[PDB]
Amino acid sequence: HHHHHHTSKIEQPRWASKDSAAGAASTPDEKIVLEFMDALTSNDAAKLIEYFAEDTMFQAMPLPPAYGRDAVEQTLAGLFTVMSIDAVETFHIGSSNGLVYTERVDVLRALPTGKSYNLSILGVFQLTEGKITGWRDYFDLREFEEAVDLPLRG
Amino acid sequence: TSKIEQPRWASKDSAAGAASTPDEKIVLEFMDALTSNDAAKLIEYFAEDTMFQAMPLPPAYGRDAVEQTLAGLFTVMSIDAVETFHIGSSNGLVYTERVDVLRALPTGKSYNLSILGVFQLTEGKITGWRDYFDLREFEEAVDLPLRG
Ligand SMILES: OC[C@@]1(c2ccccc2)CCN(Cc2ccccc2)C1
Ligand SMILES: OC[C@@]1(c2ccccc2)CCN(Cc2ccccc2)C1
Ligand code: NA
Ligand code: NA
Ligand code: NA
Questions:
Q1: Does A67 touch chain B (CB under 8 A)?
Q2: Which residues belong to the signal peptide in this entry (chain B)?
Q3: How many domains does chain A have?
């Protein structure tokens, strides 16, 4: 898809489905999640938190989880203090039992160093009545930190 | 090993960890087979046109490379247990949110590693398997580097 950020470029993985529909939404829950992926490039925790239920949680799995909407917003705002989401490409999206799975590459740029990295992520979303009750992203933190020279554990 | 606790964030939908399709059933059977630590048993599940990647490490393409890459992991690690909290699927992809209890043979240490994986199935055979997780957290937990 077009990322409207000319300094970024995402290559198609050899293993990624070529089908137009592979990363296209087939259900209402998948559509809301792709809408949320599109919103991530705002880098605005106060806009993004509107997608979440009060009883919710967030975890970038190499780092500790945040429970409840206030903590999720605070945690997302903290990440946006040091990183910009420049682009998101979702190669595969699927869903079952109220969970949505996204296999993606996020182009992330470390604001303190100016360096960016194309990060392989597999994430899961739990939705209750169209609102996010859980979001967990799985990926390797070290390879990101080393590419952008930004340790994130503390 | 001791019982693997359900995470606080796990779904309480009683079907979340159950297979709903024949492909999901195959993937759960494959998860059961992992504790064999036996690449020759595991490769029976794979198509000739296939791939495997533990995402922090380089991929293996084709059934022969996949078997040899899994056998190589088994030279240093035992899979002592696998607990699949969530399984779902769409469009021939099966997703598994899991904890794998992995033990490093050189150190004897074990860690309950959080993993999200995707499997591609064609005609009941695995044509792709990619696991996403934090490699450093595992390496530091069991005192076993896997990426120099
Ligand atoms: O794009 C959404 C994520 C994100 C990135 C940047 C700012 C907010 C949110 C959530 C988890 N994802 C992985 C990640 C977390 C922490 C550090 C590095 C990677 C990326
Ligand atoms: O349990 C199946 C996996 C596995 C583990 C151990 C031996 C063979 C296979 C497949 C890759 N998975 C990710 C992984 C790779 C290397 C180190 C830690 C995690 C785990
Ligand atoms: Na689709
Ligand atoms: Na299920
Ligand atoms: Na589905």
A1: yes
A2: none
A3: 1
